[PDB]
């Protein structure tokens, strides 16, 4: 319903993790199957998207005016709906790097111009698709995108989870700011 985010996860965790994190935001959330149909995701009243992780899932998730937090594959997906390209296999190992980062991006708002973060082995965006600037990077590897006008976001890294020096305030930015979710509950 209205003012909760919905959480399409397609990792070995389900949405446990970016559920714990929205929880402890202190936002309203939802865990739901993947393939989960866009409109189904409109008439609920859904307030925002995290989409995080080949799995079928509605293209049209990016594209009905929702704001929308890419993680990972999600990222991924988000840049191909919108005629990007990735590299297969391009980051070989785990690790936790310290990446640049534009400050200025409504995402990273608070974080310095490098930031450490955990990024898993897979792969990475190659052309950009139009519309979205590079906002994270490291060499070759693009490790975050936006679309500012459309609230389109995307994440190459992990934010969710605490090797991610400060994945939390990632979050609060995207769930807040971005999305004006309100981090209030009524007890």
Known sequence: ?????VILDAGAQYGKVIDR???ELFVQS????LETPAFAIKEQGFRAIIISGAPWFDPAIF???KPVLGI????????????????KKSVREDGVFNISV??????????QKEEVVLLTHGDSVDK???????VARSGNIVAGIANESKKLY?????PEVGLTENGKVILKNFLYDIAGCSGTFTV
């Not at 319903?1 to 985010?5: K, T």
């Not at 995307?154 to 992990?158: I, K, L, P």
């Open 1 to 5: 319903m209205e003012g909760a985010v």
């Open 21 to 23: 994190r929205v929880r």
């Open 30 to 33: 939802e865990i739901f199957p």
């Open 63 to 65: 594209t009905i005016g």
């Open 72 to 87: 990972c594959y999600g990222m991924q997906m988000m840049n191909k709906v919108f005629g990007g390209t990735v590299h």
């Open 102 to 111: 534009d400050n200025t991006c409504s995402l990273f708002r608070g974080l």
């Open 128 to 134: 950009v698709a139009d519309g979205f600037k590079v």
């Open 154 to 158: 995307g994440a190459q890294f992990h």
